[PDB]
Amino acid sequence: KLLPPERMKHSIKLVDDQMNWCDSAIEYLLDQTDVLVVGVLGLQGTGKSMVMSLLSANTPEEDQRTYVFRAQSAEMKERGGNQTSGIDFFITQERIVFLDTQPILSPSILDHLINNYNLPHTYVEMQSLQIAAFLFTVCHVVIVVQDWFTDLSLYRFLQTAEMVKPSTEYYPHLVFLQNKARREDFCPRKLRQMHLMIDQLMAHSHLRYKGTLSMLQCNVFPGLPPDFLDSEVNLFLVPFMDPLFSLLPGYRGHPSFQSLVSKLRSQVMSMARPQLSHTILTEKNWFHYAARIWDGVRKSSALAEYSRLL
Amino acid sequence: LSALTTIGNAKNWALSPTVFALLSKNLMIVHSDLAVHFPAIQYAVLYTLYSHCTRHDHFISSSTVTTATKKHFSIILNLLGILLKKDNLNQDTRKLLMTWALEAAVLMRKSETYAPLFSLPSFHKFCKGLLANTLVEDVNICLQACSSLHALSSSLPDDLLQRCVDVCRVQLVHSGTRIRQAFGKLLKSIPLDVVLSNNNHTEIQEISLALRSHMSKAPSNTFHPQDFSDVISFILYGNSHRTNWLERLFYSCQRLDKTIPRNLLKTDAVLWQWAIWEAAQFTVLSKLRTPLGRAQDTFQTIEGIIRSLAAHTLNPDQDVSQWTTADNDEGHGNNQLRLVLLLQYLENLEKLMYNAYEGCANALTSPPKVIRTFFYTNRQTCQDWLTRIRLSIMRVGLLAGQPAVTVRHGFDLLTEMKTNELEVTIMMVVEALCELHCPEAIQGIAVWSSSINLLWINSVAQQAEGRFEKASVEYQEHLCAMTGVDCCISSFDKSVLTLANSSPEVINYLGNKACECYISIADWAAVQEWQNSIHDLKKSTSSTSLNLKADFNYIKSLSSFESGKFVECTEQLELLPGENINLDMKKLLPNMLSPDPRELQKSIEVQLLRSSVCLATALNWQSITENVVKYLKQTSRIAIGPLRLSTLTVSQSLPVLSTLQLYCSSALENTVSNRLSTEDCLIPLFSEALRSCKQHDVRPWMQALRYTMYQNQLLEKIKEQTVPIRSHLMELGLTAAKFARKRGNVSLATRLLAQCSETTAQDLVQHFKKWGPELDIEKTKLLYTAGQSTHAMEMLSSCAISFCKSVKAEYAVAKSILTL
Amino acid sequence: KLLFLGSDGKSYPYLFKGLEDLHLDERIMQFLSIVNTMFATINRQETPRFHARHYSVTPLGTRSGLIQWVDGATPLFGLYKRWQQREAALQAQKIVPRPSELYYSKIGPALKTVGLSLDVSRRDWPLHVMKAVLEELMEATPPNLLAKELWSSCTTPDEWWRVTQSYARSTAVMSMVGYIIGLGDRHLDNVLIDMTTGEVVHIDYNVCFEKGKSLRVPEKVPFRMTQNIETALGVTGVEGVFRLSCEQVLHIMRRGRETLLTLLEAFVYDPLVDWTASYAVSVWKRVKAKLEGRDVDPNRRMSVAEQVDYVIKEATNLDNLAQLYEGWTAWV
Ligand SMILES: CCN(CC)S(=O)(=O)c1cc(Nc2nccc(-c3ccnc(-c4ccc(NC(=O)NC)cc4)c3)n2)ccc1Cl
Ligand SMILES: O=P(O)(O)O[C@H]1[C@H](OP(=O)(O)O)[C@H](OP(=O)(O)O)[C@H](OP(=O)(O)O)[C@@H](OP(=O)(O)O)[C@H]1OP(=O)(O)O
Numbered sequence A: 001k002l003l004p005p006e007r008m009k010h011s012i013k014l015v016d017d018q019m020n021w022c023d024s025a026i027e028y029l030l031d032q033t034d035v036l037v038v039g040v041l042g043l044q045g046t047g048k049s050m051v052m053s054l055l056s057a058n059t060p061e062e063d064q065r066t067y068v069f070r071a072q073s074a075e076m077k078e079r080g081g082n083q084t085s086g087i088d089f090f091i092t093q094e095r096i097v098f099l100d101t102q103p104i105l106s107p108s109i110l111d112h113l114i115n116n117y118n119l120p121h122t123y124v125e126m127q128s129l130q131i132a133a134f135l136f137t138v139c140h141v142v143i144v145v146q147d148w149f150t151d152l153s154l155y156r157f158l159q160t161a162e163m164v165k166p167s168t169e170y171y172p173h174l175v176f177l178q179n180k181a182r183r184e185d186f187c188p189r190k191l192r193q194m195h196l197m198i199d200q201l202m203a204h205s206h207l208r209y210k211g212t213l214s215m216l217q218c219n220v221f222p223g224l225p226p227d228f229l230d231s232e233v234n235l236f237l238v239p240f241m242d243p244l245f246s247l248l249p250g251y252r253g254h255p256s257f258q259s260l261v262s263k264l265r266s267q268v269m270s271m272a273r274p275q276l277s278h279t280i281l282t283e284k285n286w287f288h289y290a291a292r293i294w295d296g297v298r299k300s301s302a303l304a305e306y307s308r309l310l
Numbered sequence B: 001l002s003a004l005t006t007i008g009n010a011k012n013w014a015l016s017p018t019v020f021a022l023l024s025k026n027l028m029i030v031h032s033d034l035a036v037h038f039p040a041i042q043y044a045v046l047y048t049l050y051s052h053c054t055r056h057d058h059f060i061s062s063s064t065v066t067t068a069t070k071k072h073f074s075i076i077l078n079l080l081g082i083l084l085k086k087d088n089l090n091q092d093t094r095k096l097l098m099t100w101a102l103e104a105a106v107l108m109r110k111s112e113t114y115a116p117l118f119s120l121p122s123f124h125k126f127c128k129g130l131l132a133n134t135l136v137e138d139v140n141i142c143l144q145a146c147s148s149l150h151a152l153s154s155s156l157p158d159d160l161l162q163r164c165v166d167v168c169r170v171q172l173v174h175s176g177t178r179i180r181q182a183f184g185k186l187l188k189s190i191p192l193d194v195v196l197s198n199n200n201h202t203e204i205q206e207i208s209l210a211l212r213s214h215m216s217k218a219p220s221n222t223f224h225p226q227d228f229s230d231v232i233s234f235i236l237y238g239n240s241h242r243t244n245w246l247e248r249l250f251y252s253c254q255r256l257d258k259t260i261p262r263n264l265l266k267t268d269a270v271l272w273q274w275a276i277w278e279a280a281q282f283t284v285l286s287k288l289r290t291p292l293g294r295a296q297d298t299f300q301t302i303e304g305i306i307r308s309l310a311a312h313t314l315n316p317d318q319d320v321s322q323w324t325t326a327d328n329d330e331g332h333g334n335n336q337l338r339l340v341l342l343l344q345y346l347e348n349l350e351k352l353m354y355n356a357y358e359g360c361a362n363a364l365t366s367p368p369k370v371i372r373t374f375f376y377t378n379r380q381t382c383q384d385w386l387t388r389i390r391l392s393i394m395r396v397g398l399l400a401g402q403p404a405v406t407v408r409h410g411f412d413l414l415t416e417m418k419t420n421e422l423e424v425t426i427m428m429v430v431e432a433l434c435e436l437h438c439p440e441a442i443q444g445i446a447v448w449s450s451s452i453n454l455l456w457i458n459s460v461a462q463q464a465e466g467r468f469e470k471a472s473v474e475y476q477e478h479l480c481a482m483t484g485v486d487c488c489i490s491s492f493d494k495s496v497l498t499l500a501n502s503s504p505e506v507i508n509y510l511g512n513k514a515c516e517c518y519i520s521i522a523d524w525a526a527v528q529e530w531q532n533s534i535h536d537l538k539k540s541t542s543s544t545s546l547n548l549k550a551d552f553n554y555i556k557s558l559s560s561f562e563s564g565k566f567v568e569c570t571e572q573l574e575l576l577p578g579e580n581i582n583l584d585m586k587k588l589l590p591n592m593l594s595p596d597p598r599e600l601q602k603s604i605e606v607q608l609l610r611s612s613v614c615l616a617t618a619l620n621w622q623s624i625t626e627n628v629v630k631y632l633k634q635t636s637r638i639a640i641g642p643l644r645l646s647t648l649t650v651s652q653s654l655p656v657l658s659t660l661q662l663y664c665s666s667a668l669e670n671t672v673s674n675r676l677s678t679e680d681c682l683i684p685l686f687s688e689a690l691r692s693c694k695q696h697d698v699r700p701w702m703q704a705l706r707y708t709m710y711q712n713q714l715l716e717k718i719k720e721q722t723v724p725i726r727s728h729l730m731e732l733g734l735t736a737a738k739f740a741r742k743r744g745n746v747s748l749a750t751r752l753l754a755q756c757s758e759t760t761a762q763d764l765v766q767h768f769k770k771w772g773p774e775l776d777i778e779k780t781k782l783l784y785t786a787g788q789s790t791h792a793m794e795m796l797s798s799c800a801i802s803f804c805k806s807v808k809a810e811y812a813v814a815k816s817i818l819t820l
Numbered sequence C: 001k002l003l004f005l006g007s008d009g010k011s012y013p014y015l016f017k018g019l020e021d022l023h024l025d026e027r028i029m030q031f032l033s034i035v036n037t038m039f040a041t042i043n044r045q046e047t048p049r050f051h052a053r054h055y056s057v058t059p060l061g062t063r064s065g066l067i068q069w070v071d072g073a074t075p076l077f078g079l080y081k082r083w084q085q086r087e088a089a090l091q092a093q094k095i096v097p098r099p100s101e102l103y104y105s106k107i108g109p110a111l112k113t114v115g116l117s118l119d120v121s122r123r124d125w126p127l128h129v130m131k132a133v134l135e136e137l138m139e140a141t142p143p144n145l146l147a148k149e150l151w152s153s154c155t156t157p158d159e160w161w162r163v164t165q166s167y168a169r170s171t172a173v174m175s176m177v178g179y180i181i182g183l184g185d186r187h188l189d190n191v192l193i194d195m196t197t198g199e200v201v202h203i204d205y206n207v208c209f210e211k212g213k214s215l216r217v218p219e220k221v222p223f224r225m226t227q228n229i230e231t232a233l234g235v236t237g238v239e240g241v242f243r244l245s246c247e248q249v250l251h252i253m254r255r256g257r258e259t260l261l262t263l264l265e266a267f268v269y270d271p272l273v274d275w276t277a278s279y280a281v282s283v284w285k286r287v288k289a290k291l292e293g294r295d296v297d298p299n300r301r302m303s304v305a306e307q308v309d310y311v312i313k314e315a316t317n318l319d320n321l322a323q324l325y326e327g328w329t330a331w332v
């Protein structure tokens, strides 16, 4: 008489591709408290869907055709199109909510909207800003996935999104995930430059991008002392897919993909869960709060002010 | 570095700085600090050095050109040990070093001429590095280290083997599968003289320290109700409803805003203990308002389950749902695991309640004011409930083979009874102490109870020390004096035996203890006589309550197998429960099996006997070997259950019966596939246990002798060359005889001496008066222990006279003269 | 108190001692090590090891000295102090008095009612009054301060049983060693318990060789056998593993008493040992008499069992625990 409610096999659609709410996740929610919400953000081919799938209910040794979050297929890469649309939803058995996100400012959505405001160009930017603000106001942590280092345009977008957010202020933690890392990026000399650039580029961001999720203490660098870094921000690197002398494998210079994925998952799960509103909330209450926030963000006033400026 | 390979990889250049010295001693600064910021240089140097050394067979033959390279292997070993012992190595560097170490090790034992290379210190440093490099987060590295250690298992000192035993014990319970099998094989490759030693285990100590540190910390209050519900469902019902879930749960229960080692997070024992403690903390901190029900609902549920288990303990023919029936061999082990977890949960709950209403000092943090004020007013109810269920808890603990739980509960119950349940408590506590081999505690309890009719406790105290003959004689005397009728049976002289060393429940207990005593010494005739005497006593006294709880069919089967009558043994075995005799593999154990370890041991013994008789009948090569190998493999896999369970708790020791059963199963599996052609088919019980296993009774050697005589008799049906088992059998028999004589078991000692040599004092005198000197000394010692000191002294003098004119006469003449 | 660092980055604290000769402590530690060496053979077939914890001391001349620091051990007085604080806090809802103040608060009214006064000398005091005060004080302090502590400090029942057996054996060994040597002034601050293994270790090895009998308030108990110590041994008390362990220890010491006597004789004829701080000869004779079994007898040689029973009885009778120093804390 204490069996679990149900087990989710595949992620559902929390928000339709037309920016419409979809109330269909209450069937898998309970009345428990102390819930954790994780969101993702990134460009078109960064790999947010794969990261979310591997961090929620998947393993690297499994296949990409059975992932909880649909990933880009080989036939789709040749056409230069996107796969994830709208916002997804999935909750693991540990009562951890995972939220996916479509690419921001991606040319695929723009091209699809061409054959369908003053011009059909600021619409994509506003949709991206709306999603960023929503994830920044109803999620406990947000992970930013970057295909390459220093895009120089994501920081400005993040600051602008946080400046136009809906609303003793609450600022969720920010995580910088560098996907498809190489050996050259796994050196202390380059690490210092990376941390310095990240810290100097977000000096007045008001977000919690430091003091938590320190990969230096996760045994990634055995002999690297903590004082070697002026300010270790929350940055993590994810590498590319992976008689006796002649059988020695090649030298990669970076830890195994599975090891880093497991470490990242453990660190994400062992994170804090601060309060969102000025009251305690449960799973159902959190769902209702998120729905109300999305409804308010859609018919907001700051967005119109920013729209007349473009 | 890459260009230097032209001269480094030469096929035979006399320069001043040698390439080997340049890459091994000149460039020694790359491993100090450059290995952290520039690991590529270190990897390249190690790679070129390995490539240059592998082309010359690591310079083994040498250990002009030969004289110049007379100290290369030592340097290589020292470098490998120093590098492996470090803790700031990279994944690639560690993998390369492990590959090099494995290649060097496998290389070491191939020759029979490299034996002196095992005494130099560099080898010890290399072994130390290999042992310290295991137990890491990486799985492949651990597997490589285990394989390397298993390669050159022999030629290592007692210290290295002792450390390997602890490493294997801690690794036996891992979330993976390959690690468990690899370490299990490595452990099975270690002799019994070291696995059964009483040395301290460092890994177990670290695990206990980590658990203590976590418990002493302040409560986290992060355990969600769903986690508790899942744990309770998996313990009480067996269904966890979760698809390595322990690690995920532990990680989800932590917080970064607000410290068990990571290497220990892959062990299921630590995770289970942490989950149990967290569940108990959540139950206590929630005012007993768990999702299971109200404050009284949880108590009623636990009481009902405990009462059901206690009732089933009295009569095995109960068939308790969700506790005695399983679907395959995997559920049987889970049943015992769940029972152990339940007992641990109850103990933790009691500790938390006591700390809540009373408090501790420097051990547990004081709970909030609300918890203390609530537990202070409702302390009487908790004490009453605990006292009411203590009787059933003792029985449940005894059934699960956990004498510590029942002993602690019995002590608490006795203390609480400061004002006819007094005899049963003493009986249960005495039995539990006897199972732990603690005669001092038994004697103390006997003396303490004498100040309140209870003189039979001394018999159990004597039995706990290993004196089966005296214990059985005392049991018969007590039963005869308490019942009123002569219940004595044929046995050895009472005077010689002594010189060498009124309720139905009490009568039944004494009878069962006597039967178990006779079964332990492997005296089938005595068991039959005891059964006849018991039946006659019951028929002449109308007791209607005495009944021996021992399957006589199994005893008859054992007697037939030991006597050599396989024809009757097969017929007797056809009636025992379980799978039919070999002519499907996962479900070998029968259903409705109680979680009592004794039942599991009996089933394992039955399976071994079935395999032995099947092999004997089939022999008189893949005709009847494809199935026997699978049967033995499954038996060995199931026999490792008790060893794995022992690691779940801080026991610092391993069961002897389970370990011996597993070793016997492995020996049978090796002999069925090798037809007695390798030294791995023998039991590792050697004479070395004389100076390191003096804390064990004679039962351990009974199984070894039983399974060794079978192979000895089977040797007559093999025409090809075999291994010499006569020497092994003689040594094993002599050691067992010495162990039996040291405890006063003259009846068993006489049988062993007669068997090795191929009921009255004069009988021994008229029957006794490489292993020659040892056998003669043992015979003299037995004669002296029997009372005939003059005869023993005369025989020893004659033996010394004959030994003084022998060839060696090193450890024989001196020993005989000293004893005389 | 200082701190040192080794090659293996290990912290090794020490302690300074000036104006106090530590030459005798070194000899005492050497004697303890020699005694512990005799248990090497018996430790090969027994789960609870027969060992006596001790530290190392080294003199730096005539008055200075460096004493090793033993970590991980908690004094027994801490448990009593915490219990007193908890009781006071609980009584407050619906500082703590010192042992001397608490003892006087009960010895005052009793003496005033019996007819005497506090001005009378301690020697001329009624025995019944002291016995009644001790009985009234023991009825207030619970005897589960040490047992429950060890029980809560464990994790699994097997660990609890192991630590309990180890603690009982260690206590028996220490008690026998102290009785043979004659160590005195064993208050709660001079006894430490190791929650990791349950072993007991002593601290101040100053009042030894029967030196407590010549103090202002002589003591007759051989060792400390307080209520808490007895309760921590189990429900049996001193009739289980404690008595057997004591008998075994005495047998081992009596079998090899020749080496102990030789070592003591060597200690006596030591120009670097300040005994006064024929006394050495008397001490050696007393130790020899105790080892030979003729502790208190003209010519009868008491057996091991009889000696253990007599020593235990002399250390548990209320007639000897009442007439003791206030700081000894005979009620806890
Ligand atoms: C709670 C307060 N404490 C208990 C009092 S403690 O000291 O702070 C403490 C002590 C330990 N354990 C420990 N270990 C090593 C040494 C000592 C130690 C301490 C004090 N005095 C001596 C001493 C003095 C004089 C002589 N010599 C002579 O008297 N005549 C020749 C010999 C020894 C030794 N204690 C552990 C924890 C803590 Cl807290
Ligand atoms: O039967 P063994 O294997 O030869 O053992 C004997 C002897 O046994 P016995 O007492 O039965 O004669 C003693 O063994 P334990 O009593 O310690 O178990 C032991 O010491 P004790 O004789 O003093 O009791 C020692 O004899 P010893 O110390 O004189 O050498 C030893 O002989 P070995 O060590 O030569 O085998």
Ligand SMILES: Nc1ncnc2c1ncn2[C@@H]1O[C@H](COP(=O)(O)OP(=O)(O)OP(=O)(O)O)[C@@H](O)[C@H]1O
Pocket (backbone or CB within 6 Å): A042, A043, A044, A045, A046, A047, A048, A049, A050, A051, A064, A070, A071, A072, A073, A081, A082, A083, A084, A085, A102, A103, A179, A180, A238, A239, A240, A241
């Ligand atoms: N670390 C990686 N190493 C190798 N291949 C990767 C890695 N991460 C992603 N990929 C692959 O590259 C592509 C990235 O698309 P993916 O499905 O992971 O999500 P995405 O780029 O966030 O998608 P979307 O276009 O919806 O934003 C996929 O084909 C995936 O298999």
Ligand SMILES: [Mg+2]
Pocket (backbone or CB within 6 Å): A048, A049, A050, A070, A071, A072, A083, A084
């Ligand atoms: Mg996607």
